[PDB]
Amino acid sequence: YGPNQRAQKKGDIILGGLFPIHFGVAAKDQDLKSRPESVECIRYNFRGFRWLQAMIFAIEEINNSPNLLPNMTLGYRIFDTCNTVSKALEATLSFVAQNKHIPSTIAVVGATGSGVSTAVANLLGLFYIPQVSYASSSRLLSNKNQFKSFLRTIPNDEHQATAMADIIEYFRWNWVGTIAADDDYGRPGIEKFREEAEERDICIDFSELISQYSDEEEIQQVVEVIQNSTARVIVVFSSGPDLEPLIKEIVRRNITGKIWLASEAWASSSLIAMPEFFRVIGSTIGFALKAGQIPGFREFLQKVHPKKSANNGFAKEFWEETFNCYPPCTGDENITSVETPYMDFTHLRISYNVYLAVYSIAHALQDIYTCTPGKGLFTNGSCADIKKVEAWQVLKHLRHLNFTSNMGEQVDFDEFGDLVGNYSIINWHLSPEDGSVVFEEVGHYNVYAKKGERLFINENKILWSGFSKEVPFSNCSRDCLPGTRKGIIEGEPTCCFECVDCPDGEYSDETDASACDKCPEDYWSNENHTSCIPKQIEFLSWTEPFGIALTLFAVLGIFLTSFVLGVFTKFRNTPIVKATNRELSYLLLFSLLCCFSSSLFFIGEPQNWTCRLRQPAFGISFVLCISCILVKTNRVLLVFEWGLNLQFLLVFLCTFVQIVICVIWLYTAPPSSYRNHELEDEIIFITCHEGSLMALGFLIGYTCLLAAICFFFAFKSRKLPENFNEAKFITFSMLIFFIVWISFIPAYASTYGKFVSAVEVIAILAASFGLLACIFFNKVYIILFKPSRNT
Amino acid sequence: PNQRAQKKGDIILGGLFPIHFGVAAKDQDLKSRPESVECIRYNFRGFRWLQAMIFAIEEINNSPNLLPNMTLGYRIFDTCNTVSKALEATLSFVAQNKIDSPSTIAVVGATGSGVSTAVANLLGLFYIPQVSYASSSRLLSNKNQFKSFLRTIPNDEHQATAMADIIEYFRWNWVGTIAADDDYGRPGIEKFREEAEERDICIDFSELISQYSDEEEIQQVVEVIQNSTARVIVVFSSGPDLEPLIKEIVRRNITGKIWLASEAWASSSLIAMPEFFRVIGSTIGFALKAGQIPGFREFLQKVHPKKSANNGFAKEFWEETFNCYLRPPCTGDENITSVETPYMDFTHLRISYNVYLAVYSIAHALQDIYTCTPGKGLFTNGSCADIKKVEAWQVLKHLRHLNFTSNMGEQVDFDEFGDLVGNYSIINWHLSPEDGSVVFEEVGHYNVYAKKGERLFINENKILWSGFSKEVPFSNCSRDCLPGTRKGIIEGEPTCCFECVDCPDGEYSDETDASACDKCPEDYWSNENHTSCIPKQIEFLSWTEPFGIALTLFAVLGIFLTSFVLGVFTKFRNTPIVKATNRELSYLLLFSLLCCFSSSLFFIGEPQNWTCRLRQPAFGISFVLCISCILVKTNRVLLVFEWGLNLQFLLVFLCTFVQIVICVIWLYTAPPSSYRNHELEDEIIFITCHEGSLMALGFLIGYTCLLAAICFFFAFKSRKLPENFNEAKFITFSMLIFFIVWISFIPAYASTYGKFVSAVEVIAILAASFGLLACIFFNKVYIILFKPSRNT
Numbered sequence A: 001y002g003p004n005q006r007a008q009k010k011g012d013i014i015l016g017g018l019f020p021i022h023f024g025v026a027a028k029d030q031d032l033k034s035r036p037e038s039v040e041c042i043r044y045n046f047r048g049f050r051w052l053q054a055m056i057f058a059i060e061e062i063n064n065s066p067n068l069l070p071n072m073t074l075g076y077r078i079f080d081t082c083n084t085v086s087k088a089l090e091a092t093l094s095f096v097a098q099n100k101h102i103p104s105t106i107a108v109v110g111a112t113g114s115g116v117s118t119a120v121a122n123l124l125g126l127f128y129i130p131q132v133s134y135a136s137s138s139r140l141l142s143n144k145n146q147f148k149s150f151l152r153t154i155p156n157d158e159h160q161a162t163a164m165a166d167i168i169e170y171f172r173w174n175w176v177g178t179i180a181a182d183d184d185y186g187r188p189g190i191e192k193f194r195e196e197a198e199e200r201d202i203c204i205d206f207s208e209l210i211s212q213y214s215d216e217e218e219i220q221q222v223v224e225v226i227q228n229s230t231a232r233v234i235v236v237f238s239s240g241p242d243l244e245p246l247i248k249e250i251v252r253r254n255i256t257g258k259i260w261l262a263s264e265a266w267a268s269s270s271l272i273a274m275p276e277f278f279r280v281i282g283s284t285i286g287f288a289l290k291a292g293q294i295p296g297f298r299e300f301l302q303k304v305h306p307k308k309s310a311n312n313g314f315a316k317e318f319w320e321e322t323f324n325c326y327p328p329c330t331g332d333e334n335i336t337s338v339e340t341p342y343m344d345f346t347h348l349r350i351s352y353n354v355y356l357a358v359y360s361i362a363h364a365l366q367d368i369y370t371c372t373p374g375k376g377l378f379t380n381g382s383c384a385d386i387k388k389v390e391a392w393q394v395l396k397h398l399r400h401l402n403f404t405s406n407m408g409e410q411v412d413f414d415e416f417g418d419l420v421g422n423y424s425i426i427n428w429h430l431s432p433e434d435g436s437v438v439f440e441e442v443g444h445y446n447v448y449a450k451k452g453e454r455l456f457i458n459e460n461k462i463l464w465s466g467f468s469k470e471v472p473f474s475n476c477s478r479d480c481l482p483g484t485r486k487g488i489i490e491g492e493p494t495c496c497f498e499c500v501d502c503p504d505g506e507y508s509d510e511t512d513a514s515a516c517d518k519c520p521e522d523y524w525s526n527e528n529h530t531s532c533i534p535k536q537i538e539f540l541s542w543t544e545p546f547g548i549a550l551t552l553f554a555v556l557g558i559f560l561t562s563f564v565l566g567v568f569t570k571f572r573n574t575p576i577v578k579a580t581n582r583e584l585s586y587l588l589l590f591s592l593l594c595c596f597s598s599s600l601f602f603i604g605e606p607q608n609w610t611c612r613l614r615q616p617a618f619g620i621s622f623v624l625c626i627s628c629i630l631v632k633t634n635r636v637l638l639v640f641e642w643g644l645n646l647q648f649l650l651v652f653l654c655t656f657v658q659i660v661i662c663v664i665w666l667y668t669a670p671p672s673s674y675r676n677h678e679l680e681d682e683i684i685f686i687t688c689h690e691g692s693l694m695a696l697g698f699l700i701g702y703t704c705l706l707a708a709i710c711f712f713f714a715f716k717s718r719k720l721p722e723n724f725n726e727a728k729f730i731t732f733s734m735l736i737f738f739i740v741w742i743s744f745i746p747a748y749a750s751t752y753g754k755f756v757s758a759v760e761v762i763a764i765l766a767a768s769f770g771l772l773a774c775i776f777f778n779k780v781y782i783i784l785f786k787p788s789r790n791t
Numbered sequence B: 001p002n003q004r005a006q007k008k009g010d011i012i013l014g015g016l017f018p019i020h021f022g023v024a025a026k027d028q029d030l031k032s033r034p035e036s037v038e039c040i041r042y043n044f045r046g047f048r049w050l051q052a053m054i055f056a057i058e059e060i061n062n063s064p065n066l067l068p069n070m071t072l073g074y075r076i077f078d079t080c081n082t083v084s085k086a087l088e089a090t091l092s093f094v095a096q097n098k099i100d101s102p103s104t105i106a107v108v109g110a111t112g113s114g115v116s117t118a119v120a121n122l123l124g125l126f127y128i129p130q131v132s133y134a135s136s137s138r139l140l141s142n143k144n145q146f147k148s149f150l151r152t153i154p155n156d157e158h159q160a161t162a163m164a165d166i167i168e169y170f171r172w173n174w175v176g177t178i179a180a181d182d183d184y185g186r187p188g189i190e191k192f193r194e195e196a197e198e199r200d201i202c203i204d205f206s207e208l209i210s211q212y213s214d215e216e217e218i219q220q221v222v223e224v225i226q227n228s229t230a231r232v233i234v235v236f237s238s239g240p241d242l243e244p245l246i247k248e249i250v251r252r253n254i255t256g257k258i259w260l261a262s263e264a265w266a267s268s269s270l271i272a273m274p275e276f277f278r279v280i281g282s283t284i285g286f287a288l289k290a291g292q293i294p295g296f297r298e299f300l301q302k303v304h305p306k307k308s309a310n311n312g313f314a315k316e317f318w319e320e321t322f323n324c325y326l327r328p329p330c331t332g333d334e335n336i337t338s339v340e341t342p343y344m345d346f347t348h349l350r351i352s353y354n355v356y357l358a359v360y361s362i363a364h365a366l367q368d369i370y371t372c373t374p375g376k377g378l379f380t381n382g383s384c385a386d387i388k389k390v391e392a393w394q395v396l397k398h399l400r401h402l403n404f405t406s407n408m409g410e411q412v413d414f415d416e417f418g419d420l421v422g423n424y425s426i427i428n429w430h431l432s433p434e435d436g437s438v439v440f441e442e443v444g445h446y447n448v449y450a451k452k453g454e455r456l457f458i459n460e461n462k463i464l465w466s467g468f469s470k471e472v473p474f475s476n477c478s479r480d481c482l483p484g485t486r487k488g489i490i491e492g493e494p495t496c497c498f499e500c501v502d503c504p505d506g507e508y509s510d511e512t513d514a515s516a517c518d519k520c521p522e523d524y525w526s527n528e529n530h531t532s533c534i535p536k537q538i539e540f541l542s543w544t545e546p547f548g549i550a551l552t553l554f555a556v557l558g559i560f561l562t563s564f565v566l567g568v569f570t571k572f573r574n575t576p577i578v579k580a581t582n583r584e585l586s587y588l589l590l591f592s593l594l595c596c597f598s599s600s601l602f603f604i605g606e607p608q609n610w611t612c613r614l615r616q617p618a619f620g621i622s623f624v625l626c627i628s629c630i631l632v633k634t635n636r637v638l639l640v641f642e643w644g645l646n647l648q649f650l651l652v653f654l655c656t657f658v659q660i661v662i663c664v665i666w667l668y669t670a671p672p673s674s675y676r677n678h679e680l681e682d683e684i685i686f687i688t689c690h691e692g693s694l695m696a697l698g699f700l701i702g703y704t705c706l707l708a709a710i711c712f713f714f715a716f717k718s719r720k721l722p723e724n725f726n727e728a729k730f731i732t733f734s735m736l737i738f739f740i741v742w743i744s745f746i747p748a749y750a751s752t753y754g755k756f757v758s759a760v761e762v763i764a765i766l767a768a769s770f771g772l773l774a775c776i777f778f779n780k781v782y783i784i785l786f787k788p789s790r791n792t
């Protein structure tokens, strides 16, 4: 006969009912020293009584409506579960009694716990009795090979975990921790969330299991792992009662920084949503089912009375727990005078599910009632009769039930027995009028939209941590700027890293970089390694300051030479001084002008033209000059041997020799004007590799031997003072030439491109200048100052 | 139910065994009234288990001491591995208590964690002891919900720990998981995921299966298995819930993986088939420890459908064995020893022993109830119960405090969670050479009593991989990191597969699998392979150095020449024939030159503050002395312009001090610093000497050069006064050589590093002073060695 505290009402058809009027049982572990007696449940739950009242109201409204099942009445045998499996199981045993004078229940609306409903459906489905639950939302109840006769008016919990992952990815967090009740409601949900979050590149720090029967040390361990971690977001998948101990311990230890992502079961629970817990838990964003509309329901709630309820048996205990009677009292108080979750509501969510379940079973019964004897759902097109209806026929009609909810909706269960709905997203607020926690809706989750466009959050209503209004930071490691790269911290997950600076020559312009990048050769990483500033190029320039000095020196040399040439041109036909060789004079002067001009080739970038011309350019020009001044010496060879052609002919041997060398590189290995940087790695010199070294040596040596013979012959006879004994002058000249080159070799041996070229040009320009000077200074002086030209 | 094994007695036990493997797959669309479902495939192992229970019961009934005059009856049913059959059997068990709101006292068995949960939810309602023998889920240890559930099989958390330990023992880190979607696979796989994740082991994929998943789910699972690179696959499932996946695997011929079997299917007969074995090679599984039930086999060899009225399962057993009918009509004369079945083709009793132990434990609980004495009982006030009217909760209370010895001499004692622990044997699938059946050879041990870390013990010499090879396959996400490289993140992949990037020059990485390169200190530099660093190159002139050798020999030759000429004078040193000049000035100049030369001693090795801060000013003073001496050497027309010739000495001993002045300044203002510098080479450390005070060196050098310059001007302007070979010209040419050398040598000092800088400096000095000495003496020495014409 089941328990004695129950709600009961007769009728042709009887429906079952399991509601959590209490919260749990008295935890007195029977040591079995005596016969174990029936355990007792302890706490009270006004929400559960609201649900039971909703079911009773639905049945009464069905019995009152004249169209749905006329000339037939609905009865019920509603029991209490106290949220435990033992009570539900004894109740269901009282249900299926007559199967194998007692009424035979045809349908069961209840089992609000996914652990409770599992154990109930295991037993009901053995007799094929339809069980229409309203609040059990575990996914395991979708295995229609196990629970053959289980339907539910509440959506499955897959979309809830998906929505949790979507919310976490929307605020751009990647470091969270998960808590789930060690039950059939938290385990599968947390596993689904784990996979959905790992596929979205989200890292999970810790994962713990709790329960209302967990001892104190395990709660200590959980609080420790919560405190010892850096994750700010905590995804809780549990119900009110199985969460209350952890909340009490967290309030006692005063952990304040975290953010709670509430699941639907406890996001609106009065056990948790109280101010003293609110000050500590801070910000909670949770889900909620869609509201309902049961017109005329409040006026039914306001009529509950202990004496006017013979059918209802829990009304007495309700009166007691709400007024503390039997301190005996009157029984004529007002339910509106005290504030309890009973009528302190604005949106009916689970009560609407109970209403809908009762109405769906009534509609299946009507469907069986309005049959046509030819188009039935059973074998041979036959159909069943409502006077001897059995449970399996009602199950058959429920599987194919498809009707219209008074809100103008379509109600029809899937092939997995469940419905589907679109969640509201609420965020906990503190009412400035009362102090109580009030749930304000801030977002929506439509599950029909395509994957990726389902969530809609209105961020300006979310109140963060009570005061501030910017999204808190809950990443593992700080995201560091461009110029740096991620660096593995071994042991830690893929979301936690250090970041190391990029070396020079590599850059990174992106945030969250995986590696730095080498830029092309003529580019180089800048001072912040964020962008390769185009590199600089090494060579002498014309606007260059020291290049300016050099070029002005060259111009002055040419000016002096040409002006002296013109001054001669005054006396150019007064052989008074031209007792020397006129043509040799002009030739030497022009050779010097051109050698000077050669410096044109050392002030800018070398194209093959520039380099391979300039170098041999000096060669020929200076060699001409030297040979000319040399032949300027006494005619000893002429004395030893058809016009003076000889003199010209003489020079026009030596010259060719070196012109010879030029042509060789013209077709063997001409110098290469190319870019070189390997010795600087930051700036690219533009140098000119010698075409054939030893052949340059040969050239220079030939020239120096010509100069050396000139030197020897000018000195050895340097003491024959003819017209101021220019032997000595030219000797001193050739020696200056020697010394300059000598001393300047080192620099050429120990320097890069730029100053190498600069020193080379200085050397040449100045040496030729000195030659010209040493040869003319005296003569010009005398023929400008002492016009004593008779001998 | 109708078919059952029933025997009467004073005390009744219950049993639940999977005689069949499952029910006939047929979906009732409920067009008609549903009827009793039927079971399809036979299970000889379950029948051996049932026979073990019956054998234990009858043997206890035959013992004189254990339950002396009592009698044990039993009512054994079949679960068909489904929940509905078990639940209707249970409803048949609790009929006596159900009528409150043939009473059994205890039930032995569920065989399945789902069946166990569904049964214990109902049995714990009446406090009836349920002693399972194979239910190994961890959810049944929650004694707040399953009050009266005891099991004689170890829990399955140690099994997940053992699997993680095996994986980290064979050095794998890229694995994948498969689980049955029931109360046995899900908790085990979650526990293994935790245990692996804490050991830094990666899990590539994670799937769920069941015997009811249709072709598309299995195809998606096989796609996930194939499109991955993990070789090791852990499987937490039973035989039936794994058979479809195995069929699909053997059809698609996936033939590369390594299977880590859980206990349920490691020794299963549905999976251990020779045809499946070709593609499921290299199977490594767990097993319970063997038992000894003496006299069991002979009891098995007596089954017969006629002489078994208590047992009812014998008829279908014979029909399934001989494939007969009681199509060809059957006859009770066959030989159960002829056909080969999982019934009698066994070698170790592992789950039959658990049934034996469960029955014996219930018997010993009843015994403890029986040999109790008043005042020493366990119930209220020390009171004790009567065995002739024993109730279920009393046997439960006695079972919680049960402690006895097995037939093998071990201590059976249920933990406070109602489960006794045991070791694990570790087997590996082999192929029998004779017939061809799969043979399970024991290759390892797992002791749960040893401390964490030294529990596993594998014998590598017996494991054979893939049938032919004998080296452990490679199943890592990425190949290892060789020395000289470092790990590099791939943005999307998990932590255990990376890339290999090279350490830059200046950093090395000797360790394998290094997360970052290390920079060697100031003294060292990376190798070529960036493996270890070697010391950075030092930079300075050395004495054994070749060019240092050339320099030092030049210095020695200079000193030799000077000193030899000094001695040659010493011959004529008192013949003022040539000494018409100033004797003492002569000696002073010669000594100054010898010492300036000797100064070169300070440019051939590393500078200590001594060396640098002495050498530099060393040249200063020595050469300045020499210059002033030769200078004063010119006739003092200034002296005429101006008590002994002290004046001359005094003269010089002004100028000198000036520069000695400068020295003392750096002596206490900023003396040069002999330090190491490398920033311009980064590979070899020069050992240079930063100037103490630059502009003051400039002042010093300038003072010296102005002295030289006045000497030059005065020697030339009068360079045409040929007194004793007009040495005015000689000394002028000298001072000019000095000038030219310094001029031309400035550039190198301006454009070079340490080493050749010092070398050029020393060359310059040495040679210049040499030339001075020469230009001043060559002629005079020549004449007084060759033309001794000294009269005027």
Ligand SMILES: *[C@@H]1O[C@H](CO)[C@@H](O[C@@H]2O[C@H](CO)[C@@H](O)[C@H](O)[C@H]2NC(C)=O)[C@H](O)[C@H]1NC(C)=O
Pocket: A172, A173, A174, A201, A473, A475, A479
């Ligand atoms: C925490 O880490 C995540 C990445 O794991 C960051 O999310 C990125 O945010 C930027 C800016 O919106 C996006 O461009 C990226 O696409 C995001 N990454 C991914 C994978 O979507 C997040 O910004 C970090 N949190 C903070 C405060 O910076």
Ligand SMILES: *[C@@H]1O[C@H](CO)[C@@H](O[C@@H]2O[C@H](CO)[C@@H](O)[C@H](O)[C@H]2NC(C)=O)[C@H](O)[C@H]1NC(C)=O
Pocket: A420, A421, A422, A444, A445, A446, A447, A448, A449
């Ligand atoms: C799913 O959430 C969405 C959000 O409103 C609801 O879909 C809307 O319903 C109304 C009426 O059909 C339309 O005006 C909107 O256009 C719909 N939005 C979209 C994107 O289609 C819907 O009501 C929710 N699901 C249920 C069963 O109510």
Ligand SMILES: *[C@@H]1O[C@H](CO)[C@@H](O[C@@H]2O[C@H](CO)[C@@H](O)[C@H](O)[C@H]2NC(C)=O)[C@H](O)[C@H]1NC(C)=O
Pocket: B421, B422, B423, B445, B446, B447, B448, B449
């Ligand atoms: C599990 O672990 C070992 C088996 O390897 C058993 O301990 C050994 O038992 C024998 C005899 O009992 C001793 O001689 C050894 O010294 C033991 N070895 C160690 C390391 O202790 C142990 O008995 C097994 N546990 C059970 C319940 O059988």
Ligand SMILES: *[C@@H]1O[C@H](CO)[C@@H](O[C@@H]2O[C@H](CO)[C@@H](O)[C@H](O)[C@H]2NC(C)=O)[C@H](O)[C@H]1NC(C)=O
Pocket: B171, B172, B173, B474, B476, B480
């Ligand atoms: C696969 O990855 C693991 C992870 O390191 C490697 O394990 C290492 O193996 C060497 C050799 O014994 C050990 O010295 C290391 O200590 C191990 N690493 C860790 C963190 O324990 C393994 O070597 C890799 N597989 C192969 C074939 O190289």
Ligand SMILES: C[C@@H](N[C@H]1CCN(c2ccc(CC(=O)O)cc2)C1)c1cccc2ccccc12
Pocket: A615, A618, A619, A622, A690, A696, A699, A700, A701, A703, A704, A741, A748, A749, A760, A764
């Ligand atoms: C401008 C100069 N040539 C310069 C530039 C190219 N050449 C050179 C020398 C040395 C090295 C490296 C080394 O050996 O250390 C590389 C190049 C020396 C020149 C012009 C005309 C006639 C010359 C007659 C005689 C010497 C020079 C002459």
Ligand SMILES: C[C@@H](N[C@H]1CCN(c2ccc(CC(=O)O)cc2)C1)c1cccc2ccccc12
Pocket: B616, B619, B620, B623, B691, B697, B700, B701, B702, B704, B705, B742, B749, B750, B761, B765
């Ligand atoms: C050995 C030499 N001193 C050398 C070495 C140190 N000093 C120096 C010069 C220039 C720079 C950098 C720059 O300005 O480019 C750095 C150091 C020049 C010396 C010895 C004795 C008397 C001297 C009298 C006059 C000049 C030199 C004298």
Ligand SMILES: N[C@@H](Cc1c[nH]c2ccccc12)C(=O)O
Pocket: A112, A113, A114, A115, A135, A136, A137, A138, A184, A185, A239, A240, A264, A265, A266, A269, A350
């Ligand atoms: N889905 C919840 C049931 C539930 C929904 N809302 C609730 C509110 C309070 C308690 C329980 C619930 C479960 O599986 O347990």
Ligand SMILES: N[C@@H](Cc1c[nH]c2ccccc12)C(=O)O
Pocket: B111, B112, B113, B114, B134, B135, B136, B137, B183, B184, B238, B239, B263, B264, B265, B351
């Ligand atoms: N322990 C398994 C059942 C099991 C163990 N060993 C077995 C051998 C054969 C069949 C089933 C089993 C479970 O929890 O369900």
Ligand SMILES: *[C@@H]1O[C@H](CO)[C@@H](O)[C@H](O)[C@H]1NC(C)=O
Pocket: A254, A256
């Ligand atoms: C709890 O922690 C917060 C952190 O600031 C602090 O403000 C508050 O005073 C603490 N309250 C108690 C009771 O410790």
Ligand SMILES: *[C@@H]1O[C@H](CO)[C@@H](O)[C@H](O)[C@H]1NC(C)=O
Pocket: A333, A334, A335, A336, A337
């Ligand atoms: C309760 O008492 C009466 C009867 O219900 C009602 O009119 C009254 O408004 C209620 N009291 C309050 C404070 O609302």
Ligand SMILES: *[C@@H]1O[C@H](CO)[C@@H](O)[C@H](O)[C@H]1NC(C)=O
Pocket: A402, A403, A404
């Ligand atoms: C049944 O479902 C269809 C569409 O699915 C809808 O048109 C109809 O209104 C539903 N109800 C009935 C009674 O057909």
Ligand SMILES: *[C@@H]1O[C@H](CO)[C@@H](O)[C@H](O)[C@H]1NC(C)=O
Pocket: B253, B255
């Ligand atoms: C199956 O896989 C194995 C290994 O690749 C190969 O030898 C064999 O040919 C494949 N096909 C069949 C039918 O076995």
Ligand SMILES: *[C@@H]1O[C@H](CO)[C@@H](O)[C@H](O)[C@H]1NC(C)=O
Pocket: B335, B337, B338
């Ligand atoms: C047949 O039964 C008996 C056992 O007593 C014996 O002849 C023999 O063992 C059995 N046959 C075979 C092949 O074992």
Ligand SMILES: *[C@@H]1O[C@H](CO)[C@@H](O)[C@H](O)[C@H]1NC(C)=O
Pocket: B403, B404, B411, B413
């Ligand atoms: C259990 O039995 C053994 C053998 O009598 C004994 O050693 C032990 O003390 C007993 N009690 C416990 C708690 O083990």
Ligand SMILES: [Ca+2]
Pocket: A018, A019, A020, A081, A082, A083, A084, A088, A111, A112, A113, A116
């Ligand atoms: Ca309930």
Ligand SMILES: [Ca+2]
Pocket: A198, A199, A201, B492, B493, B494
């Ligand atoms: Ca990923």
